[PDB]
RNA sequence: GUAAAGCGCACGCAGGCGGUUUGUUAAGUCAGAUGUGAAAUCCCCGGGCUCAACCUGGGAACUGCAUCUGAUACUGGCAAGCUUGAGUCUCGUAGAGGGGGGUAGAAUUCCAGGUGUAGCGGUGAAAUGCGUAGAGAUCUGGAGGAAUACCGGUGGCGAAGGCGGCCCCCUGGACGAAGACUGACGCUCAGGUGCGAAAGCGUGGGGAGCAAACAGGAUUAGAUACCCUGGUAGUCCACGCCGUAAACGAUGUCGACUUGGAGGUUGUGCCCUUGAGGCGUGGCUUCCGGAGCUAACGCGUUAAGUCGACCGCCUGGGGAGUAC
């Protein structure tokens, strides 16, 4: 999936502090990584549907984490989108 | 996924009594207990205890009379996605009276017979005969 | 736990989840009957037998299994008790009215040899009846003198003599038997969790019951 | 499941449903009251025409709606959480999971040449066909396309369709476990979106073997077939379309319970592990079978048993999955 390094790296920039990987913000950010990094893999090949299946699962999922965050605290939500430049 | 914990409790007992299980454990919870009380005060179950400190497990000791179990019939009624609420003058009578119907009134979880006298109605729950 | 300590469990691992409540442990791929309830069950049942035995109650012992057959016939003959150690004919109980006629032959035929009323007739003819008696003694033999269903039934093993118990519990005839793991206690109304095998195991209780029977009738 | 009926399969908006604790609210729920619910019908009790129909006094009912006053268990709203659901991280594990690109050996066919000589090929026989312009057989060299013996399995992976040589590159999911983290972020899903065997369609390639069409030979009464001799599309590839199948477990998805037996595959823990190993314990998977279920066959902890949440579908046969 994603490199162990790039992982821990992002777990800090968005993680509530460190050692924690459950933080909503974290997950969302972590997903966006593969989501974006995969665009390249899919920009090429294309016919690799089975792999796409995984891609969408990440998107649809992130959509929930984000949507959820907005409900539990609009703040973190609005800010989170900014750093990852999402929501159109 | 678990969308109705009450149903699981009732099912656990019916399937338990069928297999002649000494008792039956499960994740306790206020309502579950309150309902169990009625079952105890009615002689359908021997006793019950909720262990655990941060994870309550309700131990429901099944009961059997002669060559059969006490609870011969127990099915949920006011299930989700279709709740049922009756009036004091509209309380159901299980097995012509020989049976009971757990009802959650504003006064608490009591048997139909009892609530019907307390001059109050409420949401049925199931029929234990 | 006297001589009882000389039989332990039985049946490797085929067992039967129904006998679980009567099992103790299982070493070397074999369950061991929990004596903790075995011997306690012993008296509880044995007492009932003598209870009705007192009224000369018709007792019918069952045990076709070769290894234990001979023993059963002997013990059950220690009094008005009866026995069956040769292929439990289908109906000798539930179909007594019909099976009885067979016993009659065993009688009327025995008298033939029993008395001088046999020497007559050619070899072939006589021979024909001699062979016939043999077989009859196997099955009816140990029941030829029981004009009527037994007051109670006692079979060694359940599974094996399953057919017997079925006809018994149908006539309301109290069924007493020794079941072990693989056996099914849902039939015998008086379970006796013991090794249904071992020559020592069979005779052990076989004589035990017999005794309580002779002493049963005052 | 087989009688009519599980969408071919997924993702998922709306919608429906929602683990657990405390507080709070009181909207649904419940209790009481006040209005109102025309009278007449209906029903109960009782009257009057000689009875009855009929007529009539009072009550019950009008199961509803509104408001007022409370009750707070349950559902809902709010606040604060909690960790067992779900998810993230770490480290491991197996795999024909997918896309791209290489590559190897066996074999078929074809081309060239040597040896060699009268048959080969085919069938039940035959015949068509191929042979003296030298086949077949055999040997040597070369060209090319397709598929990967053995391993191989009751096997494995995938949502389904489906996926087998070896290597690299890019990439998805699943599982176990010492745990660490988030804190109900979940389940289902009309419409919608995407994936869809084979055949088929378009453009451009490719084309060895097999083979609809087609052409011969045969069989037969006939033989627009089965068989034989050939052989085009196609089968192969790229990109676009088609969207169907007995798309089958003929069995929707999610979760919880309910005797047992024998086996497979994979993770992991313990055991002189000194051992092949034995014992546990998760995931997935065969067959047998108990209770129970079922019209029966059968299913049977991977249920068609016992339950809860959501969805899809059926309502006699033909006409017809046809017409418009
Ligand atoms: Mg059919
Ligand atoms: Mg059908
Ligand atoms: Mg299907
Ligand atoms: Mg009116
Ligand atoms: Mg609440
Ligand atoms: Mg095709
Ligand atoms: Mg084409
Ligand atoms: Mg699978
Ligand atoms: Mg089966």
UniProtKB/Swiss-Prot annotation, chain A:
Biological-process GO terms, alphabetical:
cytoplasmic translation; regulation of translation; ribosomal small subunit assembly; translation
Which CDD domains did the record assign? Ribosomal_S15p_S13e
Cysteine disulfide partners in this protein: none
- The keyword Ribonucleoprotein appears for this protein: yes
Query: What does induction of this protein depend on?
Result: Part of the metY operon that extends to pnp, also has its own promoter.
Q: Which GO terms describe its cellular component?
A: cytoplasm; cytosol; cytosolic small ribosomal subunit
One Pfam match, given by its short name, reads: Ribosomal_S15
Q: Is the keyword Endoplasmic reticulum in the record? A: no
User: Keywords of this protein's UniProt record, alphabetized?
Assistant: Ribonucleoprotein, Ribosomal protein, RNA-binding, rRNA-binding, Translation regulation
Q: Which InterPro entries match?
A: Ribosomal_uS15 (IPR000589), Ribosomal_uS15_bac-type (IPR005290), uS15_NS1_RNA-bd_sf (IPR009068)
Gene Ontology molecular function terms on file: rRNA binding; small ribosomal subunit rRNA binding; structural constituent of ribosome
The entry assigns this protein to a family as follows: Belongs to the universal ribosomal protein uS15 family.
* Protein's job: One of the primary rRNA binding proteins, it binds directly to 16S rRNA where it helps nucleate assembly of the platform of the 30S subunit by binding and bridging several RNA helices of the 16S rRNA. Binds to its own mRNA, stabilizing it 5-UTR and preventing its translation. In the E.coli 70S ribosome it has been modeled to contact the 23S rRNA of the 50S subunit forming part of bridge B4. In the two 3.5 A resolved ribosome structures there are minor differences between side-chain conformations.
PANTHER family given for it? RIBOSOMAL PROTEIN S15, BACTERIAL AND ORGANELLAR (PTHR23321), SMALL RIBOSOMAL SUBUNIT PROTEIN US15M (PTHR23321:SF26)
Subunit arrangement? Part of the 30S ribosomal subunit. Forms a bridge to the 50S subunit in the 70S ribosome, contacting the 23S rRNA.
Quote the protein name from its UniProt record. Small ribosomal subunit protein uS15
Protein's gene: rpsO
Curated annotation (Swiss-Prot), chain B:
Q: Which Pfam families match?
A: Ribosomal_S8
Q: Which Cys pairs does UniProt list as disulfide-bonded? A: none
The record's Gene3D superfamilies line, in alphabetical order, gives: 3.30.1370.30, 3.30.1490.10
A GO cellular component annotation here is: cytosol
Q: In this entry, which stretches build a coiled coil?
A: none
> Which Gene Ontology terms cover its molecular function?
rRNA binding; structural constituent of ribosome
Q: Does the keyword Protein transport apply?
A: no
Domain of life here? Bacteria
Q: Which GO terms describe its biological process?
A: cytoplasmic translation; regulation of mRNA stability; regulation of translation; ribosomal small subunit assembly
UniProt keyword ATP-binding, yes or no: no
Swiss-Prot/TrEMBL keywords: Repressor, Ribonucleoprotein, Ribosomal protein, RNA-binding, rRNA-binding, Translation regulation
NCBIfam families referenced in this protein's UniProt entry, alphabetically:
PRK00136.1
- Its biological function? One of the primary rRNA binding proteins, it binds directly to 16S rRNA central domain where it helps coordinate assembly of the platform of the 30S subunit.
The entry's family comment says: Belongs to the universal ribosomal protein uS8 family.
Q: Subunit structure, per the record? A: Part of the 30S ribosomal subunit. Contacts proteins S5 and S12.
Q: What is this protein called?
A: Small ribosomal subunit protein uS8
Question: What is the gene name?
Answer: rpsH
Swiss-Prot record, chain C:
Keywords for this protein: Ribonucleoprotein, Ribosomal protein
List GO molecular-function terms, semicolon-separated: structural constituent of ribosome; zinc ion binding
Q: Does the keyword tRNA-binding apply?
A: no
Query: Which branch of life, at top level?
Result: Bacteria
For biological process, the GO terms are: cytoplasmic translation; ribosomal small subunit assembly
Its GO CC terms are: cytoplasm; cytosolic small ribosomal subunit
Q: Where are residues bearing N6-succinyllysine located in the sequence? A: 107
Keyword Ribosomal protein in annotation:
yes
HAMAP family found in the cross-reference section: Ribosomal_uS2_B (MF_00291_B)
Q: Which NCBIfam families match?
A: rpsB_bact
What job does the chain carry out? Required for ribosomal protein bS1 (rpsA) to bind to the 30S subunit.
The text of the family note is: Belongs to the universal ribosomal protein uS2 family.
Q: How is the subunit organization of this protein annotated in UniProt?
A: Part of the 30S ribosomal subunit, contacts bS1. Some nascent polypeptide chains are able to cross-link to this protein in situ. In collided ribosomes contacts ribosome rescue factor SmrB.
Q: This protein is called what? A: Small ribosomal subunit protein uS2
Organism source for this protein?
Answer: Escherichia coli (strain K12)
């Amino acid at each position: 999936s994603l490199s162990t390094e790039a992982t821990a790296k992002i777990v800090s920039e968005f993680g509530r502090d460190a050692n924690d990987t459950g933080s909503t913000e974290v997950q969302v950010a972590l997903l966006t990584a593969q989501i974006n990094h995969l665009q390249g893999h899919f920009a090429e090949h294309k016919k690799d549907h089975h792999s796409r299946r995984g891609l969408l699962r990440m998107v649809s999922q992130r959509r929930k984490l984000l949507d959820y965050l907005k409900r539990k605290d609009v703040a973190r939500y609005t800010q989170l989108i900014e750093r990852l430049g999402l929501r159109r | 996924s678990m969308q109705d914990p009450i149903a699981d409790m009732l099912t656990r007992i019916r399937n338990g009594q069928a297999a002649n299980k000494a008792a039956v454990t499960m994740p306790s919870s206020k309502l579950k207990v309150a309902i169990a009380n009625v079952l105890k005060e009615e002689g359908f179950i021997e006793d019950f205890k909720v262990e655990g400190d941060t994870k309550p497990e309700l131990e429901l000791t099944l009961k059997y009379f002669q060559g059969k179990a006490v609870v011969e019939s127990i099915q949920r009624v006011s299930r989700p996605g279709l709740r049922i609420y009756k009036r004091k003058d509209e309380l159901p009578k299980v097995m012509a009276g020989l049976g009971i119907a757990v009802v959650s009134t504003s006064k608490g979880v009591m048997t139909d017979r009892a609530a019907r006298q307390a001059g109050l109605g409420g949401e049925i729950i199931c029929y234990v005969a | 736990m006297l001589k009882a300590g000389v039989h332990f469990g039985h049946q490797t691992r085929y067992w039967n989840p129904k006998m679980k409540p009567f099992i103790f442990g299982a070493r070397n791929k074999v369950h061991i009957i929990n004596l903790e309830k075995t011997v306690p069950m012993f008296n509880e049942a044995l007492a009932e037998l003598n209870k009705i035995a007192s009224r000369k109650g018709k007792i019918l012992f069952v045990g076709t299994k070769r290894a234990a057959s001979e023993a059963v016939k002997d013990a059950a003959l220690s009094c008005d008790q009866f026995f069956v150690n040769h292929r439990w004919l289908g109906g000798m109980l539930t179909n007594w009215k019909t099976v009885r006629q067979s016993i009659k032959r065993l009688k009327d035929l025995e008298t033939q040899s029993q008395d001088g009323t046999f020497d007559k007739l050619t070899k072939k003819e006589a021979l024909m009846r001699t062979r016939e008696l043999e077989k009859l003694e196997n099955s009816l033999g140990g029941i030829k003198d029981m004009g009527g269903l037994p007051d109670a039934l006692f079979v060694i093993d359940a599974d094996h003599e399953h057919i017997a118990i079925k006809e018994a519990n149908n006539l309301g005839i109290p069924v007493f038997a020794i079941v072990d793991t693989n056996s099914d206690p849902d039939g015998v109304d008086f379970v006796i969790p013991g090794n249904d095998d071992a020559i020592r195991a069979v005779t052990l209780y076989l004589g035990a019951v017999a005794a309580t029977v002779r002493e049963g009738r005052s």
